[PDB]
Design a protein around this ligand. Structure first.
Ligand SMILES: [Fe+3]
Ligand SMILES: [Fe+3]
Ligand SMILES: [Fe+3]
Ligand SMILES: [Fe+3]
Ligand SMILES: [Fe+3]
Ligand SMILES: [Fe+3]
Ligand SMILES: [Fe+3]
Ligand SMILES: [Fe+3]
Ligand SMILES: [Fe+3]
Ligand SMILES: [Fe+3]
Lengths: 296, 296
């Protein structure tokens, strides 16, 4: 009795090889093409040129950056090693499974970019302090564990909701700082790395939200309403926790009010990516022009 | 708001962010730089320039080529969506996890490469016949499922042995064809894609084998003997299966005996990657230096 016979039994259909000549969902190919074409590595950006401006930054600024970047690094660590991966089994097409492997890899590249920035500008005590801060912080650990509870759960649709919220919402309490600083001529090369990351995350959230929408419409009227309710519920939970997290990061700086608006702006985009209307009135998402500007 | 409470409750340990500033195993960084530095996409090679060569090939050579590439596509599909992934949970470091995400993505790039070749050279009927052929070939499905049985199992070391045997041995009955044709000045651009793939597999086999050695060295001398026994028994089973697959593919062309020597040559490398002596003596592993060079 071969150590594998039992398996070859429980799985009688032939194992299929991916065929990119027959694509059910052209969306997978458009996205595969956009993500692979947007390949980049942090080494290609001269972060060493931000050393002067990094020095010109106040202590509170350097400190906020270390922490924000560490929080971002942590989210991409989860998304690359646990998130994107958890979506594989529920893929509608094999081409979609291929896209998720690109997403998982690009997330490791995102996490690594921050280390390239840190190592070029910061000091080890700073790096070490930042990383310790990230393990101790209750709001950061809380959002990291809520998202993980879903990836480790058994609900395919929920995993996609959590992932779209992480990609379209959780990352921005963070992207705000480098966009703020770069509009004020601080850490511009570093902002270029952030822009490449943002170019990926916008696609990631768009694509995964798209797959959640196609999945959800495959359900009964009642179930569809339950998933809608589930999404808004998690969105509020994540949002409240992000508020407390934002207060702790930006208050010394006094950027808090503008950051909170940036959060509501992205919470809406995350819900739209999932096919739902926003959670916040438009007037409550009036983020400073200079910020949404730095982006595009 | 309550649903994810038990999960947190039980997971009171801090989720950690990856830190590339502190590398406990230098090999992880070396392999990461090597694999990312070797990034490539099939669109980069002028496969269309092989059209003249392809058309001059006999129907038998074409048929064998279609079949070996569909077989190769199937192995990469598995490795990319099931294999590399199944290794993340057993990683010794987080940087090793990062490496596996790159392996997963490059396996999808590999699989996609065969389709770019097909779409450029073969007729759709040929393409459909080839994938259909791969779903029904007993030996191909048997090696796919033997390997999958281990990725789905619960032994971390056996997943690495299976993966290493896949990377350093199982692809080779298929790699023989393009290397040989390449040595006859045929399908040379396709061969450049195959060489890029081999450049990746070589490193995957070596890295995963190296992590297997690290884990096995931690066990008692006796347990280490059982894992060696298990590794050789799997190699015997895979080799016997591979000979039959080889016959199915190469008998018409009459290249079987030479492909079997090439299987033996690579079976020794795969065992060496796992830290063991080769199985076949040198005089049974003769490979034309025109194929070896065509390799590197
Ligand atoms: Fe990311
Ligand atoms: Fe992302
Ligand atoms: Fe508060
Ligand atoms: Fe409060
Ligand atoms: Fe408050
Ligand atoms: Fe491969
Ligand atoms: Fe490989
Ligand atoms: Fe036979
Ligand atoms: Fe025979
Ligand atoms: Fe036989």
């Amino acid at each position: 009795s071969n150590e594998y016979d039992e398996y070859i039994a429980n799985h009688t259909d032939p194992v299929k090889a991916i065929n990119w000549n027959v694509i059910p969902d052209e969306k997978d190919l458009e996205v595969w093409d956009r993500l692979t074409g947007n390949f980049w590595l942090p080494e290609k950006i001269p972060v060493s040129n931000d050393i002067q401006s990094w020095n010109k930054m106040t202590p509170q600024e350097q400190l906020a950056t270390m922490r924000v970047f560490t929080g971002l690094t942590l989210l991409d660590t989860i998304q690359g090693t646990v998130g994107a991966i958890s979506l594989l089994p529920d893929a509608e097409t094999m081409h979609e499974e291929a896209v998720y492997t690109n997403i998982a890899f690009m997330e490791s590249v995102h996490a690594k970019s921050y280390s390239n920035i840190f190592m070029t500008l910061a000091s080890t005590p700073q790096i070490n302090e930042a990383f310790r801060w990230s393990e101790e912080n209750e709001n950061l650990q809380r959002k990291a564990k809520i998202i993980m509870s879903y990836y480790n759960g058994d609900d395919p649709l929920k995993k996609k909701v959590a992932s779209t919220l992480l990609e379209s919402f959780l990352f921005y309490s963070g992207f705000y700082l480098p966009m703020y600083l770069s509009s004020r001529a601080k850490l511009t090369n570093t902002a270029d790395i952030i822009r490449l990351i943002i170019r990926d995350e916008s696609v990631h959230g768009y694509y995964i939200g798209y797959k959640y929408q196609q999945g959800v419409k495959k359900l009964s009227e009642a179930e569809q309403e339950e998933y809608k309710a589930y999404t808004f519920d998690l969105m509020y939970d994540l949002y409240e926790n992000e508020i407390e997290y934002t207060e702790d990061i930006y208050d010394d700086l006094g950027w808090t009010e503008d950051v909170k608006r940036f959060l509501r702006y992205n919470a809406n985009k995350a819900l739209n990516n999932l096919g739902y209307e926003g959670l916040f009135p438009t007037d409550e998402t009036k983020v400073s022009p200079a910020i949404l500007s730095s982006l595009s």
